[PDB]
């Protein structure tokens, strides 16, 4: 019934400096040939307080999709620090990978992302304004949250 199943998502280059682009190796199986495109997105939840600070880091179109197993590395540039509220810069946030068929999102893979300083004097005495060039992004890859949605597949 669900013409697309996501088999695996591997978090590549992790942990890494905050400014490094996100890299996810995605494997997915396609039950039948797809008449339309799959739209993949990487969204960064910049502020836990509001949804207005969520940043779509990249949106990729993959199609047409023949039946079978496919694999691709979804890469997206790091979020704009200019849009990240200071209070939500250092600590645990969320990164999402969402796939969409015919304008309907059918799967959302969420990961907790822990942004922390690596230097001892920064960890003990952090700056008032976060230094994003000294922050290390650590996606907690061993614990993703997968959510599937019921969509109209013809």
């Amino acid at each position: 019934m669900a013409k697309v199943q996501v088999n695996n998502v591997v978090v590549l280059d992790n942990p890494s400096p905050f400014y490094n682009p996100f890299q996810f190796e995605i494997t997915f199986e396609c039950i039948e040939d797809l008449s339309e495109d799959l739209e993949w997105k990487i969204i960064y939840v910049g502020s836990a307080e509001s949804e207005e600070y969520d940043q779509v880091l990249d949106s990729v179109l993959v199609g047409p999709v023949p039946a079978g197993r496919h694999m691709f590395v979804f890469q997206a540039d790091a979020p704009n620090p200019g849009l990240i509220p200071d209070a939500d810069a250092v600590g645990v946030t969320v990164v999402l990978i969402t796939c969409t068929y015919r304008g309907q999102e059918f799967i959302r893979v969420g990961y907790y992302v822990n942004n922390e300083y690596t230097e001892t004097e920064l960890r003990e005495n952090p700056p008032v304004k976060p230094d994003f060039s000294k922050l290390q992004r650590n996606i907690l890859a061993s614990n993703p949250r997968v959510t599937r949605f019921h969509i109209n597949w013809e």
Partner: peptide, 4 residues
Amino acid sequence: ARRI
């Protein structure tokens, strides 16, 4: 926007 981008196409793989």
